[PDB]
Amino acid sequence: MRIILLGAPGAGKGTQAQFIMEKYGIPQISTGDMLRAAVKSGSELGKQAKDIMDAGKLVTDELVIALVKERIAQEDCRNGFLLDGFPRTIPQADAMKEAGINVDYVLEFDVPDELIVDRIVGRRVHAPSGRVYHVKFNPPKVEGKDDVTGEELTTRKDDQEETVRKRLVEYHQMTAALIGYYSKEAEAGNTKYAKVDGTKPVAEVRADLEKILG
Ligand SMILES: Nc1ncnc2c1ncn2[C@@H]1O[C@H](COP(=O)(O)OP(=O)(O)OP(=O)(O)OP(=O)(O)OP(=O)(O)OC[C@H]2O[C@@H](n3cnc4c(N)ncnc43)[C@H](O)[C@@H]2O)[C@@H](O)[C@H]1O
Ligand SMILES: [Mg+2]
Ligand code: NA
């Protein structure tokens, strides 16, 4: 199974990705996670993203296309994968088409703009795994600690309010058009498309997605 997650910043894509990965045993391909990891490790492919992400801007198409192409060539992607943050622009989507990368589901996470800032400012992450928490809405069992590894959670450098607002502008300017893109693909029978209410509690969004994915 191959899946794309669409939605504004903070819509809950990464949170729900964890559950989908487990049930269907496919890896999460998170371009945000991959870019942050490249910056942290000083990897030649992706370290350039540091200043761009801090500015709340999109990394160039060619860089993230290269990162994704490298990542889905791995053997753990041979029987399916979950795309989380990719594609993020029309050219990124067309690059997938050009490469002949078909998907089975495109899942849109709907959340009002007014909820995004207070979600992201409370976000805490376990970088090695991609797991994320919220200090109020979805906290760890032990404050500041990853539930699975017990390792110390961190705060992303680009998660302050002003940077979030810039990300939201970028989204509406560049990324929202992917709804129509994959809605059109679905009408052609090239994939299924489904929209969920991302304001529901985490477990209910999970249940709604499970009902769609069967
Ligand atoms: N293809 C690409 N092309 C170009 N540039 C790219 C790129 N991909 C990345 N980049 C670059 O990387 C930068 C950062 O991008 P990115 O890594 O994607 O961060 P983002 O834009 O802020 O949005 P996320 O996808 O991380 O949020 P999410 O939808 O996964 O929600 P989450 O589960 O975390 O949840 C949010 C919070 O709410 C909580 N939460 C989750 N679900 C619920 C719920 N139902 N109820 C209450 N709280 C919830 C969570 O605990 C969490 O705290 C970009 O600006 C860009 O520079
Ligand atoms: Mg994500
Ligand atoms: Na398909």
Author numbering: 1 to 214
Q: What text appears in the publication on this structure?
A:
The Pro177 to Ala (P177A) mutation was chosen because proline at position 177 is conserved in AdK11 and introduces a kink in helix 9 whose importance in the enzyme's opening/closing dynamics has been demonstrated by all-atom molecular dynamics (MD) simulations. The apo and holo structures of both variant enzymes are very similar to that of the wild type with only minor differences in the conformations of their AMPbd and ATPlid domains. The catalytic cycles of the two AdK mutants are thus supported by the same underlying structural framework as that of the wild-type enzyme. When bound to Ap5a, the NMR spectra of the wild type and P177A variant of AdK feature a single set of resonances because the structural interconversions of their bound states are rapid on the NMR timescale. To assess the accuracy of these measurements, we also determined the diffusion coefficients of the P177A mutant, which were almost identical to those of the wild type. While no similarly pronounced change in the rate constant was observed for the P177A variant, this mutation is significant because subsequent analyses showed that both, this amino-acid replacement and the Y171W variant, redistribute the native energy landscape of AdK (see the section kcat versus kM and kcat versus KD compensation).
AdK catalysis, which plays a vital role in cellular energy homeostasis by catalysing the reversible magnesium-dependent formation of ADP from AMP and ATP10, is dependent on distinct ATP- and AMP-binding subdomains (ATPlid and AMPbd). The turnover rate of AdK is limited by product release, and it has been shown that the microscopic step accountable for this slow release is the re-opening of the substrate-binding subdomains. AdK populates two main structural ground states: an open substrate-free state and a closed Ap5a-bound state. The ground state structures of the P177A and Y171W variants in their apo- and Ap5a-bound states were determined by X-ray crystallography.
